[PDB]
């Protein structure tokens, strides 16, 4: 005899994922800041 058969086709894979990252920061040496009220001043003791 000569016979044949069939089987299910099987495949394999490696899927993987990656993201990465970042960071940020901004500033400066302050002076005076900000104030709503801003007027000439006299300071007694």
């Amino acid at each position: 005899r000569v016979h044949s058969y069939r089987g299910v086709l099987i495949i394999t894979d490696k899927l993987s994922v990656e993201a990465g990252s970042r960071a940020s920061l901004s500033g400066y040496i302050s002076d005076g800041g900000t104030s709503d009220v801003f007027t000439i001043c006299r300071l007694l003791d």
Partner: protein, 102 residues
Amino acid sequence: TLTIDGKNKILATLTPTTIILHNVDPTADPTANKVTQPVAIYFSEPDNGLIASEDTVNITVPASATVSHYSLWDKCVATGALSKPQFFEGIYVISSVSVDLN
């Protein structure tokens, strides 16, 4: 009416190295109607007058093609019809193929 020893000695000399698929029946003419390129196949040692391929075989069927039969080469030594024809492109999976004298 060969004994098991004769069948085992006989089958040890079959060395089909490759297989090819055909859309037309290759029994009448095994040289034409090539659907897929040759794919290597491996066969085990004879036992009780029978041999089978040791591992699965994967074949790439070209575009818009159909497969109906197969033929073994090493020269041609055997032919046979697939269990069912199939119009696919894709991969056709052939499990163990057995040659028997029983």
